[PDB]
């Protein structure tokens, strides 16, 4: 027949999977004027995107929510955003001093205010002091009568965070650089892995508020009007149960103690702060959930927990194991840290709740062992309403307990749709044509 | 090289015979001497505030050069200076008459006349001509 | 307070379409390939260093500045058992670049040194008359 010759094409719409660098592209309003928002790092890239979207309608791309790289690039960056911000603030090495702590006039908690001699920046004469110290940060030392010492002296350094900054979790949109198209599944029956039907293409991902909480997920993002629950093997016992429920469950948590301002001794140009006085009467902080909807919720969960084996033996159980930082429910609220007891939330089922919250001050970094941030609060009481669009469970009559040791799994619940592919725009094909040759 | 920024469009094409006043030639006679290797005769001696800024300066010299070659490269107008196309001008873009655009007008005012409409013209060259002619050329090689 | 539907095309919009429908779409994937705390800068060079390579390979093949072009290199039916009209009317590109992935290195050597190297020694020596 005819002779065929190769023919070069450019801009051919193909891709392979690649692992490249994405970049922050945040909000850009009210970042100026004292907003040292540590998530924004003063509005990281000021884009405020217009997230357009192109449907492709003939494309099947075999996704995977479990071998995704985008969740790995967050957990690199978030502690990396801490580390530059943890640097210039005040170091707290010279404070690990033996104490004399007595009972405070209006349980185990704030009973002990303390006193110790220190000579930080004057470097001439020591001076005793008065502070306010909770539990969960002190140790009654040996061979002495009522003498305390901070729990994390002989770890790495105990640098605090500065009061200019704010940990306010504004939504961050991950955009893609040139030559990379972030894709997104358009099927809401997407169970986590496998193929999709009519994958689209966005410039930039949707709202991701990088909140930090164990055992739940607060200001999250929720699917349509079925409850979807995904996991890795979903038969294996030591995996993580990602729960996406179709409605929100409203939460109130408050700190009724009128904590105030304060003046503690100065480092070298470094004023250090330790929580000033309460107004004179102590009410212990608590979360406060509308317990009807929560009771309504968990029977709705075993509707969709069930349909992978039989029609029998569903229960709910509370957590277990170790010190209360991994036991009790952890989350932040506006420059303040909460460890709340959540044993009441996990009664079993069949086919207004007040929770005792606990607050500490010396708080470990989230995954590294070693350094640890620190922040005394601002004046007044604290209130933050919130939401719930998910929780983290484990397998163990088939026992479900609230597990959790990685908020990447929270970010896996946020990024269960996305995939970044590089363009290989050059391509060739044969036809009958031929270059003119003389 | 901006010597005729107050001249008119019907007259600035006269002096544009010089290579846009040797536009790109000023870059190569710069980067021959921007690439004075005294930077390598020091290894900058450190990382300094200027070398951070020079690094962010050379990138924009790289990128914004490419965005002007690529758009000339895709338009079937690679490397030329005055090329015609096959796209018909639509009077909805500008209802100015002929001589007013050329004889009686600056350049930068004419930018603000069609800075709205500019992006539509970009697509209406490629998908109308340079995407299009390549298929019709390849049909004329099928025989 | 804005919004209208699609007019021309989207980015990667033809990537589920056939070849005969995607061949009129190449410019949108051609424009946005280049434009789009050090770790932005390390991206801003890789995006350049990938663009030059694809630009360079078109340059060697006598096919720089054109979006499409033809050569005189013969297609070898050992590379594809696919029929002709199945390719231009049924197969998408994303599938197509899994099928000729192995042969790609043979192709690129058999463009330059085959023809466009040879179309210069033949070209230079068509003088003297």
């Amino acid at each position, epitope marked *: 027949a005819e002779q065929l010759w190769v023919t070069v094409y450019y801009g051919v719409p193909v891709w392979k999977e690649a692992t490249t660098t994405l970049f922050c592209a945040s909000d850009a309003r009210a970042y100026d004027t004292e907003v040292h928002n540590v998530w924004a790092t003063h509005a990281c890239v000021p884009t405020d995107p217009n997230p357009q979207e192109v449907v492709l309608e003939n494309v099947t791309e075999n996704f995977n929510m479990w071998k995704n790289n985008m969740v790995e690039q967050m957990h690199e960056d978030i502690i990396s955003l801490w580390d530059q911000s943890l640097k210039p603030c005040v170091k707290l090495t010279p404070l690990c001093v033996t104490l004399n702590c007595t009972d405070l006039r209006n349980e185990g908690g704030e009973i002990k205010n303390c006193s110790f001699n220190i000579t930080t920046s004057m470097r001439d004469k020591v001076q005793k002091e008065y502070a306010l110290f909770y539990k969960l940060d002190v140790v009654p030392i040996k061979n002495d009568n009522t003498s305390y010492r901070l729990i994390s002296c002989n770890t790495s350094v105990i640098t605090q965070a500065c009061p200019k900054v704010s940990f306010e979790p504004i939504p961050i949109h991950y955009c893609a650089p040139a030559g990379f198209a972030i894709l997104k599944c358009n099927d809401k029956k997407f169970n986590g892995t496998g193929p999709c039907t009519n994958v689209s293409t966005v410039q930039c991902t949707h709202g991701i508020r990088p909140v930090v909480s164990t055992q739940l997920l607060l200001n999250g993002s929720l699917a349509e009007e079925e409850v979807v629950i995904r996991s890795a093997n979903f038969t294996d016992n030591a995996k993580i149960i990602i729960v996406q429920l179709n409605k929100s469950v409203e939460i109130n948590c408050t700190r009724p103690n009128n904590n105030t301002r304060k003046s503690i001794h100065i480092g070298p140009g470094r004023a250090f702060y330790t929580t000033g006085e309460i107004i004179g009467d102590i009410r212990q902080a608590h979360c406060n959930i509308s317990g009807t909807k929560w009771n309504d919720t968990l029977k709705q969960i075993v509707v969709k927990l069930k349909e992978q084996f039989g029609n029998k033996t569903i229960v709910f159980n509370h957590s277990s194991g170790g010190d209360p930082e991994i036991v009790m429910h952890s989350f932040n609220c506006g420059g303040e840290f909460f460890y709340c007891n959540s044993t009441q939330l996990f009664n079993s089922t069949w086919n207004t709740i007040v929770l005792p919250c606990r607050i500490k001050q010396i708080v470990n970094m989230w995954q590294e062992v070693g350094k640890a941030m620190y922040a005394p609060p601002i004046k007044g009481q604290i209130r933050c309403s919130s939401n719930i669009t998910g929780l983290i469970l484990i397998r163990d009559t088939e026992i479900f307990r609230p597990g959790g040791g990685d908020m990447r799994d929270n970010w896996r619940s946020e990024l269960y749709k996305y995939k970044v592919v590089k363009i290989e725009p050059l391509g060739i094909a044969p036809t009958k044509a031929k270059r003119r040759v003389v | 090289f901006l010597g005729a920024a107050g001249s008119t469009m019907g007259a600035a094409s006269m002096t544009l015979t010089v290579q846009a006043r040797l536009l790109l030639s000023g870059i190569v006679q710069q980067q021959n001497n921007l690439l004075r290797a005294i930077e390598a005769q020091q290894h900058l001696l450190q990382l300094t505030v200027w070398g951070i800024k020079q690094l962010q300066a050379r990138v924009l010299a790289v990128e914004r050069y490419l965005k002007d070659q690529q758009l000339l490269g895709i338009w079937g107008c690679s490397g030329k200076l005055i090329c015609t196309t096959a796209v018909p001008w639509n009077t909805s873009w500008s209802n100015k008459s002929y001589n007013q655009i050329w004889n009686n007008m600056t350049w930068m005012e004419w930018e603000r006349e069609i800075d709205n409409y500019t992006s539509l013209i970009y697509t209406l060259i490629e998908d109308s001509q340079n995407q299009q002619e390549k298929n019709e050329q390849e049909l004329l090689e099928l025989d | 307070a804005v919004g209208i539907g699609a*007019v021309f095309l989207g980015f990667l919009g033809a990537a589920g379409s056939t070849m005969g429908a995607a061949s009129m779409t190449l410019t949108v994937q051609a424009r946005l390939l280049l434009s789009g705390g050090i770790k932005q800068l390390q991206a801003r060079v890789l995006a350049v260093e990938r663009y030059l390579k694809d630009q360079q390979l078109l340059g060697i093949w006598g096919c720089s500045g054109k979006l499409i072009c033809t050569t005189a290199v013969p297609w070898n039916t050992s590379w594809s058992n696919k029929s002709y009209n199945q390719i231009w009317n049924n197969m998408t590109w994303m599938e197509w670049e899994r099928e000729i992935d192995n042969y790609t290195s043979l192709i690129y050597t058999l463009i330059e040194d085959s023809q466009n190297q040879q179309e210069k020694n033949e070209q230079e020596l068509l003088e003297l008359d």
Partner: antibody
Amino acid sequence: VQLVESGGGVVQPGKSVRLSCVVSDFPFSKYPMYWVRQAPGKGLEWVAAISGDAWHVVYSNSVQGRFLVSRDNVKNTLYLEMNSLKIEDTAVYRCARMFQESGPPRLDRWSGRNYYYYSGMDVWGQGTTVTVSS
Amino acid sequence: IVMTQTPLSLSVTPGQPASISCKSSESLRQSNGKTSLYWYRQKPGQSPQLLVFEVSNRFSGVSDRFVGSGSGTDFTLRISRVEAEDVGFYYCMQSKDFPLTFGGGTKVD
């Protein structure tokens, strides 16, 4: 400038009229328009909107599909035609101009889709009134 | 979206400052860099007239004592030394997206 309407009055259910707002002096093809409905003793309800080139039309959900709007940039007119009339449509209609100027449509590069910008109003016509009853 | 306001009735006399706020459910900040909330006034029996277009700027024929401010959700219009002819209603009008709604219109006597 001068901004009034015409064709108002009173009709029955199931009927169909068309008003006529006429502008005076500004370049009419440059600007988009609107329609608003103040019920007697109530607040205001937005009705409709046209682009400047008469290409983009956005209706309220309640009057969706029933009404009709159009432009004539040469005759500098503005029409609100209506169909399938109900008694609760009895209110004051007002013709109204956008405050700002609008541009041509935008055509974002990344997806071949134009964009018509829409902002609010400054010049309300005094407007006619249509009553639907027996 | 939903956007109501408060208080409905402020039957006052001239000589004092006060303010009228309009409360937003959806936050307003368009990607142009501005918050499309338009405050204006009708008189009884009249088609309305523009008081201020943006929450920052004003309109022609407007006394200087008409000041407005607000966040993306909080929105406030303040009238210093409330003038004798401040009768009728005061509608808060937003321009985020469609259908763009109103407030009830605060009556001031």
